[PDB]
Amino acid sequence: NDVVQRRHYRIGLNLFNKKPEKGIQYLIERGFLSDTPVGVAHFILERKGLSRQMIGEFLGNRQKQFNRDVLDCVVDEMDFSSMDLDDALRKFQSHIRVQGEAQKVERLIEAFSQRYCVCNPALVRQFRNPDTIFILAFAIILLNTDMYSPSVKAERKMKLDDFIKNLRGVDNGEDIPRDLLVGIYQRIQGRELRTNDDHVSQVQAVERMIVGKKPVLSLPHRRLVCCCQLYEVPDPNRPQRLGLHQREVFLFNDLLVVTKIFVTYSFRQSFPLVEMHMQLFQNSYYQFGIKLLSARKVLIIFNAPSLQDRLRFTSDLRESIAEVQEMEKYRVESE
Amino acid sequence: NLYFQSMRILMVGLDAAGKTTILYKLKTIPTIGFNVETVEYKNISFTVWDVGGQDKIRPLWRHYFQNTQGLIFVVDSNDRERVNEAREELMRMLAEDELRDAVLLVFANKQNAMNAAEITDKLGLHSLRHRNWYIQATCATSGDGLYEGLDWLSNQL
């Protein structure tokens, strides 16, 4: 019962990482989350296993009043007192992945700039128009995109003076103090804006180790569960050489990826976990056998180096299958 | 098409029209900020920016209007409730003097959706006198039409 509840919890995380408002609804009904926008704001900021990209997608929605209130609650948890605007923006973006369409970026910078002004009323009052802080924060992340996007060639990147000239007359026809912009530009130039890691970061690292053609693995909802070394068995009724067909197997919460050493790995095959079945076997030629089926239908046969390796891997896989079958049950109750 | 050319295109459109999807099908961790991918078609390299914002934010894009050869406007052919604000979204961008000579490609995405004639009228495309523009029916999720409009776009540049 205790394992089944942590499973239902992870289901909630999965649902959020596919459609956040369905995961919020899920976690609330199951009794894991408070239904107030301030409780969701704490959950988003604190709980691990949430795609920071999908947190942004959720917070960036400018049509839903719940998402907007949650976003307002999220920034109220951050303190930008006596921080440079870029520095405060960096702290804000370290939590939420502020990347995507111009409209989503605008909504997030909007709530952020409002919070920064509350946190620095004096400095903000030093401007003809407090809309400057918002326009400047927007321009800051735009400089980050321009400066570090690989798709913006070097020669066409915005130089420091192009940056200062792009902000002329913003403050009710006046300029922002030039010495200030130079400081913003130099700091961004010395440190690219970068999100805090999440679980998608571990899948992205597995994607890098695999060279050549491969499926897109680092989807927001996918989480890396296990790395294991196994031997693929083409024939369990006949022996094979010692250490033959050695595989680098990657178990995700909803996908089994089989690779071999190409450290670098060549992608061989991936299996979904829906309808996947599992049975352990041990005969004369294979002492630590693992047979994967589909319902019935052999998918692949493995022989673990040791029984601890088979015990650890088989345990993770059995839970990932059960977790996936929960996703199916829910994903069909969608009236 | 002898010489490799690098050109800048601006993608404009309301949220939920399908700007991200279209850009995804025509290209590591994306740089923090606005979408900007490269699109190489027939020996032309298109740097494509996702552009937008409210009035007081728009003039920050003028730096990128100077070297802009094409505009791609994505509209949700199904969101009739938002087509009038889509028209305002497109027209406010076309009011910039720095974009006077850019060519316009309109992706009618998600084809009870409005047809091409309905969107041409509601978006006011025929009111653009000295503009070279073209409307292309497309399904962003099925890749249908994307490269036909990209054909027209490159032929014009």
Side-chain angles (χ1 to χ4, degrees), chain A residues 197-208 210-212 214-236:
Chain A
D197 292 317
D198 53 23
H199 66 282
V200 188
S201 299
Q202 286 139 52
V203 181
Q204 294 177 348
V206 182
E207 279 176 329
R208 292 186 231 262
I210 292 174
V211 303
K214 71 164 75 64
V216 162
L217 301 179
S218 59
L219 290 163
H221 71 266
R222 179 161 296 120
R223 188 182 54 85
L224 177 68
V225 179
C226 195
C227 292
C228 188
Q229 302 192 69
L230 299 172
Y231 308 122
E232 177 171 341
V233 175
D235 194 338

Side-chain angles (χ1 to χ4, degrees), chain B residues 87 89-99 101:
Chain B
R87 189 193 183 281
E89 172 69 291
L90 166 64
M91 290 306 185
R92 279 219 159 106
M93 201 61 62
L94 292 188
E96 303 281 335
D97 222 348
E98 304 270 356
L99 296 159
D101 297 319

